[PDB]
Symmetry: D2
Subunit: 459 residues, 4 copies
Amino acid sequence: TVRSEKDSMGAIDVPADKLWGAQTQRSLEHFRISTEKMPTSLIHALALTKRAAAKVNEDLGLLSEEKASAIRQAADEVLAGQHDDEFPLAIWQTGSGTQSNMNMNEVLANRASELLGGVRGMERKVHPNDDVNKSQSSNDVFPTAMHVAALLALRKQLIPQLKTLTQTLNEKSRAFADIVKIGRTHLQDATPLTLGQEISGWVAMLEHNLKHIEYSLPHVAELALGGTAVGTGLNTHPEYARRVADELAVITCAPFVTAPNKFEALATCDALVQAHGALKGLAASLMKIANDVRWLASGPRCGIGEISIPENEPGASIMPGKVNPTQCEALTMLCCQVMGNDVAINMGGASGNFELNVFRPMVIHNFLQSVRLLADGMESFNKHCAVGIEPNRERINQLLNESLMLVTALNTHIGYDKAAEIAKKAHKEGLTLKAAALALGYLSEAEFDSWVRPEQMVG
Amino acid sequence: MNTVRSEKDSMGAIDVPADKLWGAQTQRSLEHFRISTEKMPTSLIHALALTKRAAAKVNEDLGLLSEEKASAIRQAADEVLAGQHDDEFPLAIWQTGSGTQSNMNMNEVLANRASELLGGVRGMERKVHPNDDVNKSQSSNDVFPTAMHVAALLALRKQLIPQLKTLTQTLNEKSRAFADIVKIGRTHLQDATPLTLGQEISGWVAMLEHNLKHIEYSLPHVAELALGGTAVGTGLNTHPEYARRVADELAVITCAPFVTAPNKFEALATCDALVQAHGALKGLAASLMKIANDVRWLASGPRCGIGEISIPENEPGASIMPGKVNPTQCEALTMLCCQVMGNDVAINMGGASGNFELNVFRPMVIHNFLQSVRLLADGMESFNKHCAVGIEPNRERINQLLNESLMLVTALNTHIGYDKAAEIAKKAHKEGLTLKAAALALGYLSEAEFDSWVRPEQMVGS
Amino acid sequence: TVRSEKDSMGAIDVPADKLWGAQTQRSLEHFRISTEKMPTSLIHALALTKRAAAKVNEDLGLLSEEKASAIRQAADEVLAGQHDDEFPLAIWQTGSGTQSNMNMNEVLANRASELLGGVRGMERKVHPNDDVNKSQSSNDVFPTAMHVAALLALRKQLIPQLKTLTQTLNEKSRAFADIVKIGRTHLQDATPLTLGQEISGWVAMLEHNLKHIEYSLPHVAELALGGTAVGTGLNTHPEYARRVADELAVITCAPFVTAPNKFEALATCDALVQAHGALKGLAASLMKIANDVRWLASGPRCGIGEISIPENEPGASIMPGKVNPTQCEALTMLCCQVMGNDVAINMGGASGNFELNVFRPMVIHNFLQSVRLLADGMESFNKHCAVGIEPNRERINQLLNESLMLVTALNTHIGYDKAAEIAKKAHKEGLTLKAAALALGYLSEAEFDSWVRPEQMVG
Amino acid sequence: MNTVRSEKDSMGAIDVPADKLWGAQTQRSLEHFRISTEKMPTSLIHALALTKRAAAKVNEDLGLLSEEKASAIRQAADEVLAGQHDDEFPLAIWQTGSGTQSNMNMNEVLANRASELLGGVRGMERKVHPNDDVNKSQSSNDVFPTAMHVAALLALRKQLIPQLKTLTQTLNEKSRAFADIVKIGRTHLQDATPLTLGQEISGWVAMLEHNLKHIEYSLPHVAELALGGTAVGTGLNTHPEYARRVADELAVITCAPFVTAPNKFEALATCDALVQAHGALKGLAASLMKIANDVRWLASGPRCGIGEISIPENEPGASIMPGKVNPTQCEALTMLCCQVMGNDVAINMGGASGNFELNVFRPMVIHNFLQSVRLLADGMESFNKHCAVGIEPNRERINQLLNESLMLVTALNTHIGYDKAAEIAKKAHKEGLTLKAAALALGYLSEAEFDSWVRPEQMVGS
C-alpha cells in the first residue's frame, strides 16, 4: 500500500498508487491548511515550464534525449488531465512555491521513469532534481508558471468572454436605438435618452476595459526562468533564458519573452499587481452594468420594470412574475470577490524582501480565481441574461411621459422661467405638466402636444 | 514673518520663524517631509497636550520636576487645549513612523511657551527645556501611542457614540409613528409579501443598536495606555509608580476610564486596539450604507421611481432641470462609508507591519482612524438633522403600489382555495390587470368580497 | 443513467445515481462559475437547520412523525459524511442562497423517501418544498445556516487553536524570561529587553484577540429562522422561531437564540461583518508575530539569527543551515488573504436592499475561509514552528553587547552629556563603547564592567 | 467678518459673509454638510476654474455669450488660477455625490467677481449670473467629471511622472556606481548566493521603469472629457460643435492632450478611467514599499542589524537613546504606500456604485485619487532628495558578511569536488567556523588556494 521514498531528511512512506515523492509527502504533513490547492491552470503552466526546460536542456547537450523525451511525455499527460490527483498540495505552503515545484519534479520523474521501462520510487531512471529540475530553481520556476498561467488564462478565457458579452450588448444597443426612456440621475427623474444610448454606455465601458487589460499583457509575458536562485543565472548556459522563453512561446503560441531584468522578476509580483488592477476595473464596470440590469428589471409592479430578463429558475405558481435577477446576483457577488482579491494581491506584492518575493502561492491563487470568476461570470451573464434583455415598451413610455423634466422642451417656446413655473406647479400640486401649463394659459393643448416631443430630446 | 530665530538640537542649528514657538526638530521635520497636505488633526494635538500635562503633574508629584516648571508646562498645555496655538503644529502625517517629530513639536512648543510664562524667552536661552523637562520620563515610543488612544477614545465617547444614539432615537420614533402603514416588501429588488414601514425602519434601528454594542466592546482595549513603557517597553529608569500614576492622571483630566496597558510590549509593538476598534467602525459604515440606500431608493422619483417616502428638500442645483432636488444627505453618507472601508485597509496594513519592539506606521494609522470617527459622527449628525428627522410616508403612493401588486393574492387562499387564487394571480400578471380586476373577470368573487378578504393589515403579523 | 425530475418549469434529466432534484440540476446549468462550492461546514449547518425545523414542525403537529424522523435521519447521514458529492452547486449562485437551500431540500426529501421504503424522484414519499422546507423560506434558512456554521467554526476550530498557540508562546516566554537581548525600534539598535518579554508581547496580543473574538459571538448566535420571506413570519406558528432556535441550541450544544429583530436579520450580514472585523485583527497580530519569528531566525550568518526554528523541509547538502521559515510564509500569506476577504465581506454587507441582503453565498464563503485559514494556520504554526523556537544564546549575547545604547547605564554615574559623548565617539569612529569611554578618561575599565550591566536594564 | 449679504437661489434667500464672493448655493452646502475637515483640493478648484474658462471661451466663439461677459469670466477664472481666491471655496468633500455644490461654488464666485470686473457689484444686483452665464451650456453632471479628469491628468503629467523619472535616474546612477560590489543574496530572509549591490538596485530601477509604462498606459482614458454630455449624456440643446470645441480649448490652455469622450454615457455613468489609473498607482505603491523596505533593512543597525549600506542622517529624536537616527524617509514612504492601498478600495467601491445615467460618488473618488497622486509624487521627491541620492555601501561590512557566510562554498566544487565542498560547509555550520577555517582544519586546501579559488566577483554573472 506504501512505498518508501527518500530526500536529504531521510525516508518517508508515500502511497504506492501515487506518483509524487518524499518532498510532496512532507508538504502534506506540514501544510494542512484549509482546502485551497493549486488550480488546474497553474498545474498545467508548471508542466509546460518543465516541458520547455527539458527541451532546452536537451538542445544544449545537458540532458539526454531519452530522458528529455520521457519528461515531455509525462508533462503532456499532466496537460491531458491524466494526473489531476497527483497534485495534492495547499496554496498555503512555502512562499516561493518550492513545494509545488518539487511536486511537479517528483511526479514527472517517477512517471518518466515508467515511460522508460523503469519504476516509480527510489529505483527510478529519471531524477526529480538532477533531471526534471535541471538548470532551474524554485525561485525562477514558480514565477514563470504564474505568468504562463496568468497570460494564457487572460488570452484564452477572459478576453474572449469579454468580447462575446460586448458584442451581445452592442447588438442590444442597436436594436433599442429608437426606444426613448427617461434618464435618472441621483435616482431621480431626469431628461430622456434612448435605451440604446444607455446600453451603449455599457458597451463603451467593456471596450475600454478590454484596452486596459490588453495594456497589461506585455509585462505578464516577461518570464523569470533563467534567473535561477537570485537573478544572476549563476551556473546556467548564457542562452538558456532566451531559449526557454522561446520554447514556451512556441508550445503555447503566446508571445512569451525572457524578463529583461531578472532581479525585478524574482523580487516582485509587480506584473500581476498591475494586471489585477485592470481586472478590478472590469469588476467595477460589471458591477454597475449588472446593477443597472437588475434595477431596470425590478418589479414586476413596484419597481422600475423598464426591461424584462429571462426567467431561469422555477417559482411558486401563486407568485407569477417574481423573476429574481439571479445572474445579476452571481455577477455582483463575484465582483466584490475580485475587489477583495485585489487587496490580498496588493499586500503580497508589496511584501517582497531582497532577492525574492515569497507571497507567491497566495498572489497567484487570487489572480487566477479573479480570471475564472470574471471569465465564467461574463459567460454566464451573457448566455443566461444579457442575450435575452427585452424592453417593456408600454412601461417605458408610461414612465417617460411622467417625468416633469420633459418641461425642458418648452424653453425655446415660452422661456425657461415659465417652464420652471409649470414644473414647480405640477410638483407642488398633484398635476401633470400639461394640466399645469393649461391652468396658466402659457400655451394651448395643441401647442403642448406639438412641442413636448421626447423623441426630439435625445440629441 | 521673514525674520528668523536660530534654534538648536544635537545635530546643529536651524532657522525657525521668529513668530513661532516650535524648535529645531519641528523645523527639520517641516522641511524634510513636504508630502501632500494632511497634518495631525486637532484631536491628536490636544491628546498630545493632555499627555504632556499629565506627565508634568506626575513628574512633579514624584519629585522629579520642580513645581515652578511643571505648573508652567501645564499652563502652556492648557493654552493649546483652549485653541490658542493651532498654528504652532505644522507637521505632516507623512513623517517618521513613530510620530517622534510631533512628540518633539509638542515638547518644543510647550517648553518655549512655558519659558515665557516663567518670565523667560523662547529659543536657546529658554528656562524650560523640551527634552529634559517636557519629555521627562518619556519616549516618543510611548507618548505617541498614548496620544493616539487618548484621541481615539475621547472621539468615540464624545462625538461618535452620542450621534449614533441620536440617530437611533430618531429612527425609533419614525418606526413607532409608521407602525400601522403597510407597504410592499422587496427581496432581490422584486415585489414581495408586505410589511409595515415601521417594521422596515425597525430593522435600521436594530442595526444601529447592534453597532453601538460592538463599538462599546472595543473601548476597553483602546483605554489601555502605553505611557510608562518608554523606549522598548521595560520602563527603564522610571519610577515604579509612574505608569499607573500617569494613566490615573489622564483619567482624571479627561473624565474617561484610561488605564495603564498591562503589557507594554504589546502596547508599543502594535496598533491592535485600533485595528479592532476600526473593525467595529467599518461594520457601522456597512450598516449606514444600507440605511442611506434604502432611504434614497424609497424616496426616488418623484414620479419615475419608487416614491414611497418623502425627505426634506435642502438645496436646488444648477438651473438645468428646474426644481429637481436630489437626496444629497444620503449621497454624502454613502460616500463617507466607502471612505471608512478604504481607511480600514490602510489601518490593517499599518497594524500588520510592526517589527520587534515598535510599530512605526502610527501617524498613518491614527490619521485614518480619527478621520473615520469624524466622518461617521458628523455624517450621522448631518443625516439625522437634515434628512432622518423629516422622513414622511407618501401614503397614497404606498397604497397604490401595494394594491396594484400581485403580492396580496394569498389573502384569497382561505376563501376560494389556492388553485383559484393562483389562477387569478396568473391572469393578472399575463394580462396586466390588478388582482381584483382578474378575480372579477373570472367571476370568482364580488368586489365587496375582495375588499373584505384582502386585508394587508392582517398580513404583517403584529 | 438518468431520471426525469420536475419543478414548475417542467422536466429535466437528473443523474440516476444522485439524490438531488430538478432545481439543483437547473442551478448546475445556470451557475457554472469557477470552482468554489459550499464548504462542508455550511452544508452541515444547512442539514442541522433542516433537522431542527423538522423536529419543531413535528412538535407543532405540522409534519408527521414518520416524515420528520426520516428527514432527521437523512440529515444525520449528511452530517456523517455520507453525501458529500450530493452538493455540487457553486458559491456564485442566487444571492439569497436559494439554490443551496433547494439542494438540501431535494437531497433530504429523496433520501428520506428511500428511508421510508420509497424511491428517489417524482414518486418520492417526502417532498422537498411541502415537507423539508415547511415553515421556511430560503430567505431565513440561508442566514440561519450561515450563523450556525460561523459560530460553530469559531467555537470548535478557531478559538481552541488560538488558545493552544497562546499557551505555547506563554511557555516560551517563561522559559526565556532571563535571556537578555537587544531591542530594536525602527529596525535600529535600541535598549535591552528579555526574549521572554518580547515573546510576552506576542502572548498579550493573542489574549486580546481572543477577547475581541469572544465579544463577536453573541451577535452571530442570533438566528433569522422564523422571519420567513420578509421578516414578519407570516403564516408561521407564533412559537416556531423560539422553538427552532432552542432546538438548534440543543443539537449543537451552542447558545443559539432567535434574532430579536428579524428585519435586521434578513436585510443584513452585520453580525458577520463585525465578527470578521475581529478576525482581520487577529490576522494583523499573527502577521506581526510570524514576521518577528522569521526575522529573528534570519541567517544563519547574514541576518539577525537570535533564534532557531525547526527545519521541516530537506535542503541541498552543500547548503547546510539555510532554514527557510516556511511556516511563517504560509501564515503571512493567509493573513493577507484574510485582509482581502474582509474587503469582499464589507462590500457584500454594505449592499443589502430593502428586506433582503442577497450577497450571502459570497459573504459566507469568505468568512468560513478566513476561519479555516486562521484555525489551521495557527495549528500548523504551533506544531511545526512555535513549539520548537529556541534561543541562540551566544549570538543573542554578541548582538546585545554591540549596541551603543548600552551607554544608557552610564547616565546615573557620569551624566547624560558624557554618556552621549561616549556614544557619539564610538559611532563617529570605529570603536566600542568601552574603548571610547577609556580614551576620554570618563571612567576606568573596572567602572565600566561594573556599571554597564544589561541584566539590570530590563525593569 | 460678522456682517452679511443676502444671496438668493430658487429656494429663497440666505445670508453669506459680506467679505466673500460665493452665493446662496455655496452657503447652503457649507451649512448642510459640516462633515469632517476634508475640502476640495486646490488642484480640483483650479481644474474647475479651467473648465469654466474654456466653456466661456467656446460659448463666446459660438455667439451664445457676449464678449464682455465671457472676457470677465475668464479674467475671474485666471485670478483663481493665480491663487487669489483660495478662501472662496469652503465646501467639503462630503457633499452631494455629483459635486453640484462645488460646481455652483465656482459659478457663484466667478459670477460675483466677473460682475465686479465689469464695474458691477457682488450679490443679487450682479451683472454676470452664475447659472445663465457661468454655467451656460453645462450641467454639474458633465462639469464635475471634466474637472476630475483635468486635475488628475495634469497631476500625473506635471507632478507624479517627473518625480518618478527623477528617482529612477538616481537609482540608476547608484546601480552603475555599485556594479562591482559583490554582496550576499537573501531569499526567504536567508543567506543566498551572491549578487552585486548594483544588480540588486537595478531591480528597483526596472520596477520604476515598468511602473512608468503602466501609468503612461492609463493616461489616454483619463484624457477623455465628459464636457458636452450635459445632464444625461445626450447633450440636449447644445451646439453640435460644443463638445469638441471645449475639449480643444482645454487642450490649448493646459498644454495637455484632452479629447472629448467618444461615449458621453460611459463618461457620466462611471469613474472607470480613474479606477483603472489608480490601479497603476497602487502598483507603484507596492513597488515603492518594497524598495523602501529594502533600503531600511539594508541600512539597519548600526551594529545589531544588517548594515550593508548607509543613508543620510537627517534628524535626531528625543534625547532618550542618544545619537540614534532612524530611516524616517523610508517610514514616511511605507506609510503613504499603505494609504494608497486603502484609497484604492474606497475608489473601487465608489466606481462600482454608479446607477443609470450618473455616478454620484465623485467627490470621494477624486479626493482619494488626487491624494494618492500627491502622496506618491511628493513621497518620491522626498525619498529621492533626502535618502536615495545619498545611499552608500559599507564596503567592509558587506565583505565581512559575504566572507563569513556559507554561500561561497560552491566556488570550491571545480577544485576539490562537490563531496569535499559539502563536507566543508557542513563542518563550518556545525562548528561555527568560516568556510576557510573549516577547509584548513580538514586539510583539503591551503589558505592561498582558498583565496585564489573563492572569487565572489566570478559568481554573479556579468
